[PDB]
Design a binder for this molecule. Structure first.
Ligand SMILES: [Ca+2]
Ligand SMILES: [Ca+2]
Ligand SMILES: [Zn+2]
Ligand SMILES: [Zn+2]
Ligand SMILES: [Zn+2]
Ligand SMILES: [Zn+2]
Ligand SMILES: [Zn+2]
Ligand SMILES: [Zn+2]
Ligand SMILES: [Zn+2]
Length: 494
Protein backbone atom coordinates (compact mmCIF):
# COMPACT_ATOMS: atom_id res chain seq x y z
CA UNK A 1 0.00 0.00 0.00
CA UNK A 2 1.06 3.69 -0.32
CA UNK A 3 3.58 5.70 1.79
CA UNK A 4 1.99 8.54 3.80
CA UNK A 5 2.45 12.23 4.48
CA UNK A 6 0.43 14.74 6.51
CA UNK A 7 -0.17 18.08 4.77
CA UNK A 8 -2.04 21.15 6.03
CA UNK A 9 -3.85 22.86 3.16
CA UNK A 10 -6.15 25.71 2.22
CA UNK A 11 -9.12 25.21 -0.10
CA UNK A 12 -12.38 26.83 -1.13
CA UNK A 13 -15.50 26.10 1.01
CA UNK A 14 -17.11 24.96 -2.26
CA UNK A 15 -14.58 22.07 -2.43
CA UNK A 16 -14.88 18.80 -0.47
CA UNK A 17 -13.90 18.74 3.22
CA UNK A 18 -11.49 15.90 2.39
CA UNK A 19 -9.26 16.98 -0.53
CA UNK A 20 -8.80 13.32 -1.51
CA UNK A 21 -12.38 13.49 -2.90
CA UNK A 22 -10.95 15.69 -5.75
CA UNK A 23 -10.29 13.81 -9.01
CA UNK A 24 -6.84 15.43 -9.38
CA UNK A 25 -5.67 14.07 -6.03
CA UNK A 26 -7.20 10.58 -6.68
CA UNK A 27 -5.19 10.32 -9.89
CA UNK A 28 -2.13 11.76 -8.21
CA UNK A 29 -2.12 9.15 -5.44
CA UNK A 30 -2.27 6.38 -8.05
CA UNK A 31 0.73 7.89 -9.80
CA UNK A 32 2.85 8.86 -6.80
CA UNK A 33 2.06 5.93 -4.44
CA UNK A 34 1.66 8.48 -1.65
CA UNK A 35 -1.47 8.91 0.47
CA UNK A 36 -1.87 12.45 1.78
CA UNK A 37 -3.62 12.83 5.08
CA UNK A 38 -4.99 16.37 4.75
CA UNK A 39 -5.68 18.99 7.39
CA UNK A 40 -7.93 21.13 5.26
CA UNK A 41 -8.81 24.65 6.44
CA UNK A 42 -11.52 26.16 4.30
CA UNK A 43 -11.89 29.49 6.13
CA UNK A 44 -9.56 31.56 8.32
CA UNK A 45 -6.62 29.50 7.01
CA UNK A 46 -3.92 31.90 8.24
CA UNK A 47 -5.23 31.97 11.82
CA UNK A 48 -5.76 28.20 11.98
CA UNK A 49 -2.25 27.63 10.55
CA UNK A 50 -0.69 30.06 13.07
CA UNK A 51 -2.41 28.27 16.03
CA UNK A 52 -1.01 24.95 14.80
CA UNK A 53 2.50 26.42 14.58
CA UNK A 54 2.39 27.99 18.07
CA UNK A 55 1.03 24.68 19.56
CA UNK A 56 3.67 22.48 17.85
CA UNK A 57 0.94 20.51 16.06
CA UNK A 58 2.99 20.69 12.81
CA UNK A 59 2.22 18.72 9.64
CA UNK A 60 4.99 17.36 7.35
CA UNK A 61 4.33 20.37 5.03
CA UNK A 62 1.94 23.31 4.59
CA UNK A 63 0.39 23.16 1.09
CA UNK A 64 -1.21 26.14 -0.67
CA UNK A 65 0.19 28.28 2.10
CA UNK A 66 0.44 31.86 0.71
CA UNK A 67 2.59 33.28 3.58
CA UNK A 68 4.19 36.75 3.59
CA UNK A 69 7.99 37.27 3.39
CA UNK A 70 7.89 38.39 7.03
CA UNK A 71 6.21 35.06 7.98
CA UNK A 72 8.73 32.96 6.00
CA UNK A 73 11.65 34.74 7.69
CA UNK A 74 10.18 34.30 11.16
CA UNK A 75 9.51 30.59 10.53
CA UNK A 76 13.01 30.05 9.12
CA UNK A 77 14.63 31.93 12.03
CA UNK A 78 12.65 29.87 14.58
CA UNK A 79 13.36 26.57 12.71
CA UNK A 80 9.65 25.89 11.97
CA UNK A 81 10.44 25.45 8.26
CA UNK A 82 13.60 24.19 6.61
CA UNK A 83 15.80 25.27 3.70
CA UNK A 84 14.96 23.26 0.55
CA UNK A 85 17.60 24.28 -2.07
CA UNK A 86 19.47 20.94 -1.69
CA UNK A 87 16.22 18.99 -2.08
CA UNK A 88 15.58 20.84 -5.35
CA UNK A 89 18.97 19.96 -6.73
CA UNK A 90 18.91 16.29 -5.64
CA UNK A 91 15.29 15.28 -6.20
CA UNK A 92 13.34 17.78 -8.29
CA UNK A 93 14.11 17.55 -12.06
CA UNK A 94 10.78 19.19 -13.15
CA UNK A 95 11.44 22.26 -11.01
CA UNK A 96 15.11 22.26 -12.07
CA UNK A 97 14.02 22.38 -15.75
CA UNK A 98 11.79 25.42 -15.04
CA UNK A 99 14.65 27.17 -13.19
CA UNK A 100 17.04 26.37 -16.03
CA UNK A 101 14.62 27.86 -18.67
CA UNK A 102 13.78 30.83 -16.37
CA UNK A 103 16.64 31.51 -13.98
CA UNK A 104 15.05 34.76 -12.83
CA UNK A 105 12.68 32.65 -10.70
CA UNK A 106 15.61 31.12 -8.84
CA UNK A 107 16.68 34.60 -7.76
CA UNK A 108 13.12 35.40 -6.61
CA UNK A 109 13.01 32.15 -4.59
CA UNK A 110 16.29 32.77 -2.72
CA UNK A 111 16.41 34.62 0.62
CA UNK A 112 19.24 37.07 1.17
CA UNK A 113 20.92 34.42 3.47
CA UNK A 114 21.33 32.24 0.33
CA UNK A 115 18.62 29.68 1.26
CA UNK A 116 15.32 28.79 -0.46
CA UNK A 117 12.47 28.32 2.08
CA UNK A 118 9.40 27.74 -0.07
CA UNK A 119 8.11 26.52 -3.39
CA UNK A 120 6.44 29.06 -5.66
CA UNK A 121 3.32 29.47 -7.72
CA UNK A 122 4.28 30.66 -11.21
CA UNK A 123 1.62 31.61 -13.78
CA UNK A 124 2.88 33.28 -16.95
CA UNK A 125 0.09 34.77 -19.13
CA UNK A 126 2.35 36.48 -21.54
CA UNK A 127 6.06 37.27 -21.01
CA UNK A 128 7.86 40.54 -20.22
CA UNK A 129 6.02 43.57 -21.62
CA UNK A 130 3.29 41.30 -22.99
CA UNK A 131 2.34 39.97 -19.54
CA UNK A 132 -1.36 40.30 -18.73
CA UNK A 133 -0.17 42.06 -15.58
CA UNK A 134 1.61 44.91 -17.41
CA UNK A 135 -1.47 47.20 -17.27
CA UNK A 136 -4.08 46.69 -14.57
CA UNK A 137 -6.31 49.79 -14.82
CA UNK A 138 -7.23 49.87 -18.52
CA UNK A 139 -9.27 52.87 -19.76
CA UNK A 140 -12.48 52.09 -21.65
CA UNK A 141 -14.62 54.46 -23.71
CA UNK A 142 -18.26 54.50 -24.90
CA UNK A 143 -18.09 53.95 -28.67
CA UNK A 144 -21.93 54.20 -28.99
CA UNK A 145 -21.67 57.82 -27.70
CA UNK A 146 -18.74 58.65 -30.02
CA UNK A 147 -20.76 57.40 -33.07
CA UNK A 148 -24.00 59.13 -32.01
CA UNK A 149 -22.16 62.49 -31.62
CA UNK A 150 -20.07 61.89 -34.75
CA UNK A 151 -16.74 62.19 -32.89
CA UNK A 152 -13.41 60.55 -33.74
CA UNK A 153 -11.65 58.46 -31.08
CA UNK A 154 -9.37 60.91 -29.18
CA UNK A 155 -5.69 60.80 -30.01
CA UNK A 156 -4.41 63.36 -27.47
CA UNK A 157 -5.20 64.40 -23.92
CA UNK A 158 -6.65 67.69 -25.31
CA UNK A 159 -8.94 65.65 -27.67
CA UNK A 160 -10.11 63.67 -24.67
CA UNK A 161 -11.16 66.86 -22.88
CA UNK A 162 -13.23 67.85 -26.03
CA UNK A 163 -14.84 64.41 -26.22
CA UNK A 164 -15.72 64.39 -22.53
CA UNK A 165 -17.35 67.87 -22.87
CA UNK A 166 -19.43 66.54 -25.79
CA UNK A 167 -20.42 63.56 -23.62
CA UNK A 168 -21.32 65.98 -20.80
CA UNK A 169 -23.44 68.41 -22.86
CA UNK A 170 -24.44 66.45 -25.99
CA UNK A 171 -26.89 63.93 -24.52
CA UNK A 172 -25.42 60.98 -26.51
CA UNK A 173 -27.86 58.45 -24.98
CA UNK A 174 -30.72 60.58 -26.40
CA UNK A 175 -32.97 60.77 -23.30
CA UNK A 176 -32.97 64.64 -23.08
CA UNK A 177 -31.23 64.49 -19.62
CA UNK A 178 -27.73 65.40 -18.38
CA UNK A 179 -27.27 61.89 -16.95
CA UNK A 180 -23.98 61.11 -18.80
CA UNK A 181 -21.01 60.75 -16.40
CA UNK A 182 -18.12 61.64 -18.69
CA UNK A 183 -15.18 60.27 -16.61
CA UNK A 184 -15.22 57.89 -13.63
CA UNK A 185 -12.89 55.79 -11.54
CA UNK A 186 -12.44 54.37 -8.09
CA UNK A 187 -9.58 56.37 -6.62
CA UNK A 188 -6.47 54.83 -5.12
CA UNK A 189 -4.74 51.51 -5.63
CA UNK A 190 -6.11 48.94 -8.04
CA UNK A 191 -7.85 48.26 -11.30
CA UNK A 192 -10.34 51.14 -11.32
CA UNK A 193 -7.96 54.05 -10.71
CA UNK A 194 -7.10 56.71 -13.35
CA UNK A 195 -3.28 56.61 -12.91
CA UNK A 196 -2.87 54.81 -16.30
CA UNK A 197 -3.30 58.24 -17.99
CA UNK A 198 -0.29 59.83 -16.22
CA UNK A 199 2.10 58.25 -18.73
CA UNK A 200 0.72 60.65 -21.35
CA UNK A 201 2.85 63.23 -19.49
CA UNK A 202 5.95 61.12 -19.47
CA UNK A 203 7.01 58.30 -17.12
CA UNK A 204 3.61 57.78 -15.56
CA UNK A 205 2.60 55.94 -12.40
CA UNK A 206 1.63 52.59 -10.90
CA UNK A 207 0.31 51.22 -7.59
CA UNK A 208 3.88 50.98 -6.19
CA UNK A 209 4.74 54.50 -7.48
CA UNK A 210 7.93 52.84 -8.69
CA UNK A 211 9.33 52.29 -12.20
CA UNK A 212 12.81 51.28 -13.44
CA UNK A 213 14.45 53.62 -15.94
CA UNK A 214 16.47 52.38 -18.89
CA UNK A 215 19.55 53.73 -17.02
CA UNK A 216 19.02 51.00 -14.39
CA UNK A 217 17.81 53.50 -11.77
CA UNK A 218 14.65 52.98 -9.80
CA UNK A 219 12.33 56.04 -10.04
CA UNK A 220 9.66 57.08 -7.53
CA UNK A 221 6.87 58.29 -9.78
CA UNK A 222 4.94 60.44 -7.36
CA UNK A 223 7.57 63.23 -6.90
CA UNK A 224 8.21 63.76 -10.67
CA UNK A 225 7.25 66.98 -12.51
CA UNK A 226 5.43 64.57 -14.91
CA UNK A 227 3.20 63.37 -12.13
CA UNK A 228 2.32 66.98 -11.20
CA UNK A 229 1.29 67.54 -14.86
CA UNK A 230 -0.89 64.41 -14.70
CA UNK A 231 -2.57 65.66 -11.57
CA UNK A 232 -3.09 69.09 -13.18
CA UNK A 233 -4.79 67.29 -16.10
CA UNK A 234 -7.26 65.42 -13.87
CA UNK A 235 -7.87 68.79 -12.05
CA UNK A 236 -8.80 70.31 -15.45
CA UNK A 237 -11.38 67.54 -15.87
CA UNK A 238 -12.74 68.25 -12.41
CA UNK A 239 -12.99 72.03 -13.06
CA UNK A 240 -14.90 71.34 -16.30
CA UNK A 241 -17.50 69.19 -14.45
CA UNK A 242 -16.38 66.08 -16.30
CA UNK A 243 -15.66 63.78 -13.32
CA UNK A 244 -18.21 61.57 -11.60
CA UNK A 245 -19.33 63.53 -8.48
CA UNK A 246 -18.92 60.28 -6.44
CA UNK A 247 -15.49 59.23 -7.86
CA UNK A 248 -13.70 59.76 -4.52
CA UNK A 249 -16.51 58.28 -2.36
CA UNK A 250 -18.14 55.33 -4.10
CA UNK A 251 -17.37 51.64 -3.78
CA UNK A 252 -17.18 48.80 -6.32
CA UNK A 253 -20.89 47.99 -5.91
CA UNK A 254 -21.96 51.54 -6.77
CA UNK A 255 -19.45 51.86 -9.67
CA UNK A 256 -20.67 48.71 -11.38
CA UNK A 257 -24.37 49.71 -10.86
CA UNK A 258 -23.69 52.86 -12.83
CA UNK A 259 -21.55 50.89 -15.29
CA UNK A 260 -24.33 48.27 -15.75
CA UNK A 261 -26.61 51.19 -16.77
CA UNK A 262 -23.96 52.49 -19.22
CA UNK A 263 -23.70 55.92 -17.58
CA UNK A 264 -19.92 56.22 -18.08
CA UNK A 265 -18.17 57.96 -20.94
CA UNK A 266 -14.63 56.89 -20.01
CA UNK A 267 -13.92 54.62 -17.05
CA UNK A 268 -11.19 52.29 -15.71
CA UNK A 269 -11.22 48.58 -14.84
CA UNK A 270 -9.42 45.32 -15.46
CA UNK A 271 -12.00 43.92 -17.84
CA UNK A 272 -15.04 45.85 -19.14
CA UNK A 273 -17.12 42.65 -18.81
CA UNK A 274 -17.21 43.13 -15.02
CA UNK A 275 -18.52 46.73 -15.22
CA UNK A 276 -20.25 47.66 -18.48
CA UNK A 277 -20.83 44.04 -19.61
CA UNK A 278 -20.17 41.80 -22.60
CA UNK A 279 -21.10 44.12 -25.43
CA UNK A 280 -19.63 46.36 -28.10
CA UNK A 281 -20.81 49.72 -26.65
CA UNK A 282 -17.39 50.05 -24.87
CA UNK A 283 -13.88 49.52 -26.21
CA UNK A 284 -10.24 50.26 -25.30
CA UNK A 285 -9.30 53.93 -25.15
CA UNK A 286 -6.08 53.99 -27.17
CA UNK A 287 -2.90 55.40 -25.66
CA UNK A 288 -3.11 59.23 -25.78
CA UNK A 289 -0.34 61.64 -26.62
CA UNK A 290 0.15 64.28 -23.98
CA UNK A 291 1.03 67.98 -24.58
CA UNK A 292 4.54 66.84 -25.69
CA UNK A 293 3.04 64.93 -28.62
CA UNK A 294 4.52 61.68 -27.19
CA UNK A 295 2.93 58.42 -25.97
CA UNK A 296 3.97 56.13 -23.12
CA UNK A 297 2.66 53.29 -20.99
CA UNK A 298 4.17 52.80 -17.53
CA UNK A 299 4.64 49.15 -16.65
CA UNK A 300 3.18 47.91 -13.39
CA UNK A 301 5.33 45.64 -11.22
CA UNK A 302 2.69 42.90 -11.26
CA UNK A 303 3.79 39.33 -11.84
CA UNK A 304 2.09 35.90 -11.79
CA UNK A 305 4.32 34.84 -8.93
CA UNK A 306 3.90 33.88 -5.31
CA UNK A 307 6.99 32.95 -3.41
CA UNK A 308 5.27 30.45 -1.09
CA UNK A 309 2.67 27.92 -1.95
CA UNK A 310 4.42 25.15 0.04
CA UNK A 311 6.87 24.96 2.93
CA UNK A 312 8.40 21.88 4.56
CA UNK A 313 8.40 21.76 8.36
CA UNK A 314 11.15 20.78 10.77
CA UNK A 315 9.16 17.63 11.82
CA UNK A 316 9.18 16.08 8.37
CA UNK A 317 11.16 12.79 8.43
CA UNK A 318 10.60 11.93 4.75
CA UNK A 319 12.32 14.76 2.88
CA UNK A 320 13.11 12.85 -0.28
CA UNK A 321 9.56 11.51 -0.58
CA UNK A 322 8.16 15.03 0.07
CA UNK A 323 10.45 16.68 -2.53
CA UNK A 324 9.47 14.10 -5.14
CA UNK A 325 5.77 14.55 -4.40
CA UNK A 326 6.23 18.35 -4.75
CA UNK A 327 8.20 17.85 -7.98
CA UNK A 328 5.29 15.88 -9.55
CA UNK A 329 3.24 19.13 -9.15
CA UNK A 330 5.75 20.94 -11.43
CA UNK A 331 5.27 18.49 -14.34
CA UNK A 332 3.63 20.83 -16.95
CA UNK A 333 0.29 18.91 -17.34
CA UNK A 334 0.04 18.61 -13.59
CA UNK A 335 0.78 22.32 -12.98
CA UNK A 336 -1.91 23.32 -15.44
CA UNK A 337 -4.60 21.11 -13.84
CA UNK A 338 -3.59 21.99 -10.28
CA UNK A 339 -4.03 25.66 -11.15
CA UNK A 340 -7.24 25.49 -13.21
CA UNK A 341 -9.13 22.15 -13.00
CA UNK A 342 -9.25 18.79 -14.69
CA UNK A 343 -10.74 16.50 -17.37
CA UNK A 344 -12.60 13.19 -17.63
CA UNK A 345 -15.03 13.37 -14.69
CA UNK A 346 -18.40 11.69 -15.41
CA UNK A 347 -19.97 13.04 -12.12
CA UNK A 348 -19.68 16.80 -12.80
CA UNK A 349 -18.53 19.26 -15.47
CA UNK A 350 -14.84 19.56 -16.51
CA UNK A 351 -12.64 22.61 -17.07
CA UNK A 352 -10.64 20.62 -19.65
CA UNK A 353 -10.72 17.78 -22.17
CA UNK A 354 -7.52 15.84 -22.63
CA UNK A 355 -6.49 15.06 -26.16
CA UNK A 356 -5.29 11.41 -25.88
CA UNK A 357 -2.89 11.48 -28.79
CA UNK A 358 -1.15 14.82 -28.12
CA UNK A 359 -1.47 14.58 -24.30
CA UNK A 360 -2.64 18.21 -24.18
CA UNK A 361 -5.44 20.06 -22.49
CA UNK A 362 -8.18 22.20 -24.07
CA UNK A 363 -10.54 24.43 -22.13
CA UNK A 364 -14.20 23.44 -22.45
CA UNK A 365 -17.23 25.71 -22.68
CA UNK A 366 -19.10 25.64 -19.34
CA UNK A 367 -22.75 25.94 -18.18
CA UNK A 368 -24.95 26.24 -15.07
CA UNK A 369 -23.05 27.03 -11.87
CA UNK A 370 -19.72 25.89 -13.49
CA UNK A 371 -18.38 29.29 -14.67
CA UNK A 372 -18.77 30.56 -11.11
CA UNK A 373 -17.71 27.49 -9.09
CA UNK A 374 -16.16 24.63 -11.02
CA UNK A 375 -12.55 25.88 -10.74
CA UNK A 376 -12.86 26.24 -6.94
CA UNK A 377 -14.37 22.76 -6.69
CA UNK A 378 -11.70 21.00 -8.81
CA UNK A 379 -8.38 22.93 -8.67
CA UNK A 380 -5.84 22.19 -5.95
CA UNK A 381 -3.55 25.25 -5.88
CA UNK A 382 -0.23 24.68 -4.22
CA UNK A 383 3.22 24.89 -5.81
CA UNK A 384 3.21 24.84 -9.62
CA UNK A 385 4.45 26.48 -12.78
CA UNK A 386 2.82 27.47 -16.05
CA UNK A 387 5.25 29.07 -18.48
CA UNK A 388 4.22 31.10 -21.48
CA UNK A 389 5.86 28.44 -23.72
CA UNK A 390 3.21 25.87 -22.59
CA UNK A 391 0.34 27.56 -24.48
CA UNK A 392 -0.47 25.67 -27.68
CA UNK A 393 1.69 22.71 -26.58
CA UNK A 394 0.49 21.58 -23.12
CA UNK A 395 -2.69 23.55 -22.81
CA UNK A 396 -4.89 26.26 -24.17
CA UNK A 397 -5.03 29.66 -22.51
CA UNK A 398 -8.28 30.67 -20.82
CA UNK A 399 -10.36 32.63 -23.38
CA UNK A 400 -10.70 35.74 -21.20
CA UNK A 401 -6.93 35.86 -20.63
CA UNK A 402 -6.25 35.46 -24.33
CA UNK A 403 -8.68 38.28 -25.14
CA UNK A 404 -7.02 40.64 -22.61
CA UNK A 405 -3.47 39.70 -23.76
CA UNK A 406 -4.30 40.53 -27.33
CA UNK A 407 -5.65 44.00 -26.30
CA UNK A 408 -2.48 44.62 -24.26
CA UNK A 409 -0.34 43.72 -27.24
CA UNK A 410 -2.40 45.80 -29.77
CA UNK A 411 -2.84 48.99 -27.69
CA UNK A 412 -0.09 49.20 -25.04
CA UNK A 413 3.03 47.17 -25.73
CA UNK A 414 4.30 49.49 -28.52
CA UNK A 415 4.42 52.34 -25.96
CA UNK A 416 6.10 50.41 -23.05
CA UNK A 417 9.56 51.78 -23.49
CA UNK A 418 11.02 50.54 -20.18
CA UNK A 419 13.19 47.41 -20.62
CA UNK A 420 12.51 46.41 -17.02
CA UNK A 421 9.97 46.63 -14.25
CA UNK A 422 10.75 46.22 -10.51
CA UNK A 423 11.38 42.57 -9.56
CA UNK A 424 9.59 40.74 -6.69
CA UNK A 425 12.81 40.42 -4.63
CA UNK A 426 13.01 38.68 -1.25
CA UNK A 427 14.34 41.25 1.27
CA UNK A 428 15.87 40.86 4.72
CA UNK A 429 13.63 41.11 7.77
CA UNK A 430 15.15 44.50 8.65
CA UNK A 431 14.51 45.89 5.18
CA UNK A 432 11.00 44.41 5.08
CA UNK A 433 10.15 46.24 8.30
CA UNK A 434 11.74 49.52 7.15
CA UNK A 435 9.84 49.42 3.85
CA UNK A 436 6.54 48.51 5.61
CA UNK A 437 6.88 51.44 7.95
CA UNK A 438 7.63 53.92 5.18
CA UNK A 439 4.67 52.68 3.07
CA UNK A 440 2.32 52.75 6.08
CA UNK A 441 3.32 56.40 6.64
CA UNK A 442 3.38 57.71 3.10
CA UNK A 443 0.89 55.72 0.94
CA UNK A 444 -2.36 57.21 2.24
CA UNK A 445 -0.71 60.68 2.28
CA UNK A 446 0.19 60.43 -1.40
CA UNK A 447 -3.44 59.62 -2.29
CA UNK A 448 -4.87 62.24 0.08
CA UNK A 449 -2.84 65.03 -1.55
CA UNK A 450 -3.65 63.73 -5.02
CA UNK A 451 -7.40 63.76 -4.25
CA UNK A 452 -7.16 67.29 -2.68
CA UNK A 453 -5.34 68.63 -5.66
CA UNK A 454 -8.09 67.38 -7.93
CA UNK A 455 -11.16 68.29 -5.85
CA UNK A 456 -9.81 71.51 -4.26
CA UNK A 457 -6.80 72.44 -6.41
CA UNK A 458 -3.63 74.35 -5.38
CA UNK A 459 -0.94 71.82 -6.50
CA UNK A 460 1.46 74.50 -7.85
CA UNK A 461 1.91 76.11 -4.42
CA UNK A 462 1.83 72.92 -2.35
CA UNK A 463 4.13 70.77 -4.53
CA UNK A 464 7.51 71.70 -2.99
CA UNK A 465 6.32 71.17 0.61
CA UNK A 466 4.74 67.85 -0.39
CA UNK A 467 8.07 66.57 -1.68
CA UNK A 468 9.66 67.69 1.61
CA UNK A 469 6.99 65.76 3.52
CA UNK A 470 7.81 62.63 1.49
CA UNK A 471 11.45 63.01 2.52
CA UNK A 472 10.43 63.38 6.17
CA UNK A 473 8.64 60.05 5.75
CA UNK A 474 11.87 58.52 4.43
CA UNK A 475 11.58 58.59 0.63
CA UNK A 476 15.36 58.75 0.04
CA UNK A 477 15.92 55.71 2.29
CA UNK A 478 13.04 53.86 0.60
CA UNK A 479 14.66 54.40 -2.81
CA UNK A 480 18.13 53.42 -1.65
CA UNK A 481 16.72 50.14 -0.32
CA UNK A 482 14.81 49.48 -3.57
CA UNK A 483 17.88 50.31 -5.65
CA UNK A 484 20.04 48.04 -3.52
CA UNK A 485 17.83 45.02 -4.16
CA UNK A 486 17.45 45.93 -7.86
CA UNK A 487 21.22 45.99 -8.30
CA UNK A 488 21.61 42.67 -6.43
CA UNK A 489 18.89 41.06 -8.62
CA UNK A 490 20.79 42.10 -11.79
CA UNK A 491 23.78 40.09 -10.47
CA UNK A 492 21.68 37.04 -9.47
CA UNK A 493 18.98 36.80 -12.17
CA UNK A 494 21.10 34.89 -14.74
CA1 LIG B 1 -28.62 61.82 -21.50
CA1 LIG C 1 11.10 60.51 -9.10
ZN1 LIG D 1 -4.93 6.59 -0.07
ZN1 LIG E 1 -7.09 12.91 8.28
ZN1 LIG F 1 -5.36 23.55 14.93
ZN1 LIG G 1 22.61 29.22 6.42
ZN1 LIG H 1 -28.36 48.61 -13.82
ZN1 LIG I 1 8.12 32.68 -20.06
ZN1 LIG J 1 6.78 56.66 10.87
Amino acid sequence: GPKTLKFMTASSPLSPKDPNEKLILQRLEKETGVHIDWTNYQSDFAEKRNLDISSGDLPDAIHNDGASDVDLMNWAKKGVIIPVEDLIDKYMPNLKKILDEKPEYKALMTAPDGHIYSFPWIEELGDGKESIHSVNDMAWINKDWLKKLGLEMPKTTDDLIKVLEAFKNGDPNGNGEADEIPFSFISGNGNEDFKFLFAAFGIGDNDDHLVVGNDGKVDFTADNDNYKEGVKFIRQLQEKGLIDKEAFEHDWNSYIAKGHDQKFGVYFTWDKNNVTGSNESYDVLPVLAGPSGQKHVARTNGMGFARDKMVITSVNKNLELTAKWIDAQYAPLQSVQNNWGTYGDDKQQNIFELDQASNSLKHLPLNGTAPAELRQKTEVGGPLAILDSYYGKVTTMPDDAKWRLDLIKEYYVPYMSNVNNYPRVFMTQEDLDKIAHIEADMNDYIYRKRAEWIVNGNIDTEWDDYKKELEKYGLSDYLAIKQKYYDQYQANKN
